[PDB]
């Protein structure tokens, strides 16, 4: 299910700081990221329209680490939703529990968030759960199990979270690393760099 492969090479195929892995660094870039995605990556192909839109959809699907089929499922349901498809799509795409675990700050990577949720460490509304793919409910608290407490990594990532700035649309008290989701973000409150509509017309064939 998980991608199981080197991360920053997929990140550097585009040359962007994809935040797939950070740790002590925010980004490496010292690995010659923009120059050698592959054997012929020293020269840059100009990449036709289908390739650029598809490549962006690949990029984003990788930053959120989801497989293609249930990704398309997110697409088709997001189209079934009322209102802007790209907007509500991206919002529910942020609804994945693992992304929320990363943005809450306890987690070295969204993949690590999949690890910690898989290990029963999370405790939602007084019940343990494992699906990181799950979309957090509005005004719903989420907590970590007290036995999950003691790992040093979580807080050390919180010191990174403080540097990250963290999203405003989710409210993590962080005094007990138990945050509350609030509502699915509106397009205005986030990003303004990624361009989601590329994916939807890419499926419009």
């Amino acid at each position: 299910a998980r991608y199981l492969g080197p991360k920053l090479k997929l990140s550097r195929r585009e040359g962007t700081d994809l935040f797939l892995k950070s740790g002590v660094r925010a980004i490496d870039t010292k690995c010659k990221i923009e120059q050698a995605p592959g054997q012929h990556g020293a020269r840059k192909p100009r990449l036709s329209d289908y390739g650029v839109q598809l490549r962006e959809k690949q990029k984003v699907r990788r930053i959120y680490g989801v497989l293609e089929r249930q990704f398309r499922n997110y697409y088709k349901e997001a189209a079934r939703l009322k209102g802007n498809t790209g907007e509500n799509l991206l919002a529910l795409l942020e609804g994945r529990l693992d992304n929320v675990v990363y943005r809450m700050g306890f987690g070295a990577t969204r993949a690590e968030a999949r690890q910690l949720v898989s290990h029963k460490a999370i405790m939602v509304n007084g019940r343990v759960v494992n699906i990181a793919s799950y979309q957090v409910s509005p005004n719903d608290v989420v907590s970590i199990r007290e036995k999950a407490k003691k790992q040093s990594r979580v807080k050390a990532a919180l010191e990174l979270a403080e540097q990250r700035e963290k999203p405003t649309w989710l409210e993590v008290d962080a005094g007990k690393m138990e945050g509350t989701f609030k509502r699915k973000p509106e397009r205005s409150d986030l990003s303004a760099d990624i361009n989601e509509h590329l994916i939807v017309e890419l499926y419009s064939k």
Binding site: V24, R25, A26, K30, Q163
Partner: protein, 614 residues
């Protein structure tokens, strides 16, 4: 207690079976039709006593004899008919030699046709049998004189059937079954019947059919016209089995067995036992229990041989078999499987004595096991297949002292350390190429020693070296404790004259790399190792600075938070006037060190040890 009757045609074999039972062996329609033993017929005699004796009538035909060789498998006791009329015959002597070569544990003589001829002829056939029994070395036998029309022999024989011990075999073996006669009763399943050479099976068992290469569930089984939930080896076993496979795909000499076979082998080492001496590289019929084969023999020093099938076939170690001439008729010698896939170049002089060590020195599977571990890796699945190991038998290797057990092969600890020492000396040679290095990296070492050898065995062996403490490692580089980083001259001959000059002032690589004549990548060894010394630094790979400039550049960088209250770059320029290029390069230098952090306009300094404490 399967007990096969054997002898030449029209000795009354079937008649004998009616004498004891009044029931018959013949089941094939044509034999019914033609009144003969065209092919092996089987009969069973279920009893209130609870034994069912197994009767096997077999052709006396030499032409059909290859089928008898199919039928002599699994015999517990053998009754060789001799008729008082015809008397002893050379074919009787042939059947005795064949059973002797099969190592059939015991046999009974039964004289027939006694009333039909005058008593002097009875005594003649008696004497001739008494002469013949002495030739093959079986000793006790109960000779019975009887007419079936008279019934004279019934009582002594009936006691004799019960007298025979059953030949028990060890419970710990993978199950193995020789397919013989395929036929499908309309009720549930294929039922395939065969002799079970080893191991145990039960009605719920799934068994691996070879060729189709698939597991198949057992629907039912009948032990010997004695239906039961379980079947032990050493008896013919009707075995009804679920599976997608059907009889049209099935052929005689297909194998049913517990575990996925190692691939069929033409080559095999075999024990030679011979009534008369043989000759190298000749065609002959190989006959094993329930197996008719044709292949060419080859001689391997003295009474050691390698059989080469032109048709690859599965077989396993310690399976006794008889070897007959390819035209049929003459039986010449016995054989036994000893090595299944001998390596090529097997004939070189030092080695044959050692093969003799593998086989003559060791009868027990454990002793052969230890020899094979000494030779090199023993993939447990294959060696186990040759010995048909069960998991309880698998534990014996754990019981063995001193063996290094990875996920499969064991390796002897002293011998492991020996192989380690050889790899270590090679590793010492690499240490000679650069004695300044603490030592070679691990992955280069794994490729440098024994690339062909197993990853589990090799990495575990390295872990054993770590347990010895012989390998201490830092920065992921594994090295011997002894190295003192003396300094290799290949580094030093440039580094000595270059060192004070590059030392006393910074100098760019190329600016006097031409004066030294050195290639740039060639300096991307000497200079980076000088960086490993910690003396000359590199902001960028091409230019190298001494530490003493970097330390001053640090102390002037230190003033930003105190003079400004901001980590603006501008003081490097506002104080000593150092340029923006080299300064930003110093910034990437500490950023890559992790010595300083970037945020917004300015650098955060949350962890560095260089900052003065107050």
């Amino acid at each position: 207690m399967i007990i096969a009757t054997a002898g030449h045609v029209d000795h009354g074999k079937t008649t004998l079976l009616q004498a004891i039972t009044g029931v018959n062996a013949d089941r094939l329609p044509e034999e019914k039709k033609r009144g003969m033993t065209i092919d092996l017929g089987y009969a069973y005699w279920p009893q209130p006593d609870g034994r069912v004796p197994g009767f096997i009538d077999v052709p006396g035909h030499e032409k059909f004899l290859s089928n008898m060789l199919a039928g002599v498998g699994g015999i517990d006791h053998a009754l060789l008919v001799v008729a008082c009329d015809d008397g002893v015959m050379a074919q009787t002597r042939e059947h005795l030699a064949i059973l002797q070569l099969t190592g059939n544990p015991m046999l009974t003589v039964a004289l027939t046709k006694a009333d039909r001829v005058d008593e002097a002829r009875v005594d003649e056939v008696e004497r001739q049998v008494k002469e013949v029994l002495r030739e093959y070395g079986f000793a006790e036998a109960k000779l019975f004189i009887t007419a079936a029309t008279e019934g004279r022999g019934m009582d002594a024989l009936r006691e004799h059937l019960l007298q025979l011990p059953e030949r028990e075999h060890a419970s710990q073996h993978s199950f193995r079954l020789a397919i013989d006669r395929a036929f499908t009763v309309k009720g549930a399943g294929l039922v395939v019947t065969g002799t079970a050479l080893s191991g145990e099976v039960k009605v719920g068992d799934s068994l691996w059919l070879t060729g189709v290469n698939k597991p198949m569930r057992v629907r039912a089984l009948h032990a010997q016209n004695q239906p039961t939930e379980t079947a032990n080896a050493g008896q013919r076993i009707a075995l009804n089995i679920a599976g997608d496979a059907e009889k049209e795909q099935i052929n005689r000499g297909d194998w049913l067995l517990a575990d996925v076979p190692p691939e069929p082998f033409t080559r095999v080492i075999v024990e030679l036992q011979t009534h008369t001496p043989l000759t190298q590289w000749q065609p002959l019929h190989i006959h094993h229990a329930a197996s008719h084969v044709t292949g060419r023999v080859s001689l391997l020093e003295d009474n050691l041989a390698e059989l080469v099938f032109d048709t690859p076939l599965w077989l396993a170690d310690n399976d006794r078999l008889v070897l007959r001439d390819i035209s049929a008729r003459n039986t010449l010698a016995g054989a036994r499987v000893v090595m299944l896939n001998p390596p090529r170049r097997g004939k070189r002089k030092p080695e044959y004595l050692q093969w003799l060590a593998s086989l003559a020195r060791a009868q027990s599977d454990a002793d052969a096991l230890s020899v094979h571990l000494e030779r090199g890796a023993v993939n447990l699945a294959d060696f186990a297949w040759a010995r048909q190991l069960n998991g309880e038998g698998m534990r014996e290797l754990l019981q063995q002292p001193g063996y290094i057990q990875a996920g499969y092969s064991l390796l002897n600890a002293p011998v492991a350390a020996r192989w380690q020492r050889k790899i270590l000396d090679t590793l010492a040679t690499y240490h000679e190429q650069h004695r300044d290095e603490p030592g070679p990296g691990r992955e280069r070492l794994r490729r440098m020693a024994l690339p062909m050898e197993d990853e589990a065995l090799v990495l575990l062996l390295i872990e054993k070296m770590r347990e010895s403490g012989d390998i201490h490692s830092h920065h992921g580089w594994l090295h011997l404790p002894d190295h003192k980083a003396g300094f290799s001259e290949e580094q030093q001959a440039i580094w000595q004259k270059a060192e004070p000059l590059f030392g006393d002032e910074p100098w760019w690589v190329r600016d006097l790399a031409k004066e030294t004549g050195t290639d740039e990548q060639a300096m991307r060894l000497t200079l980076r190792q000088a960086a490993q010394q910690g003396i000359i630094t590199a902001i960028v790979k091409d230019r190298y600075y001494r530490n003493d400039r970097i330390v001053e550049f640090a102390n002037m960088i230190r003033d930003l938070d105190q003079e400004c209250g901001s980590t603006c770059a501008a003081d490097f320029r506002d104080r000593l006037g150092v340029g923006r290029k080299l300064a930003i390069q110093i910034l990437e230098y500490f950023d890559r060190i992790g010595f300083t952090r970037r945020r917004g306009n300015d650098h955060l300094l949350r962890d560095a040890l260089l900052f003065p404490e107050k």
